Write a protein that binds this ligand. Sequence first.
Ligand SMILES: [Zn+2]
Ligand SMILES: [Zn+2]
Ligand SMILES: [Zn+2]
Ligand SMILES: [Zn+2]
Ligand SMILES: [Zn+2]
Ligand SMILES: [Zn+2]
Lengths: 72, 72
Amino acid sequence: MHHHHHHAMEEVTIKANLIFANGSTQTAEFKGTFEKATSEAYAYADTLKKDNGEWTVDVADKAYTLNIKFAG
Amino acid sequence: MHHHHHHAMEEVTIKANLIFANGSTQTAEFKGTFEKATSEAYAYADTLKKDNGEWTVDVADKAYTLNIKFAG
Ligand SMILES: [Zn+2]
Ligand SMILES: [Zn+2]
Ligand SMILES: [Zn+2]
Ligand SMILES: [Zn+2]
Ligand SMILES: [Zn+2]
Ligand SMILES: [Zn+2]
């Protein structure tokens, strides 16, 4: 499944690729928590439904931070 | 839970922050599939166990690509 595991004070960058039925595309960037950032991307997509129809989305990861702590 | 959902031809960037018992740190970057990139990060961490002890890790997301397709 596609699951975002929230962390406090997270800062995530969302690159949205909008692909229209005729093959044309548009890209936009959103930043903030994963929840807020994706919400804005979806809200934007919704403003385009009137002229471009229903949309579906696939979320794919691109970057992570690994915090590795040694005990000594 | 922390779950990486694999996608074909994915290219993920891993930023590893190694935190030692005495407070000092070291950072490194790894790239490739999430699986390969994290594997290299862990392998690197293992080479430091002899002198720095056991390590634990927390994986946190940083960036995503959203592919939004309109049906028309
Ligand atoms: Zn999955
Ligand atoms: Zn979140
Ligand atoms: Zn997917
Ligand atoms: Zn979770
Ligand atoms: Zn993968
Ligand atoms: Zn975590």
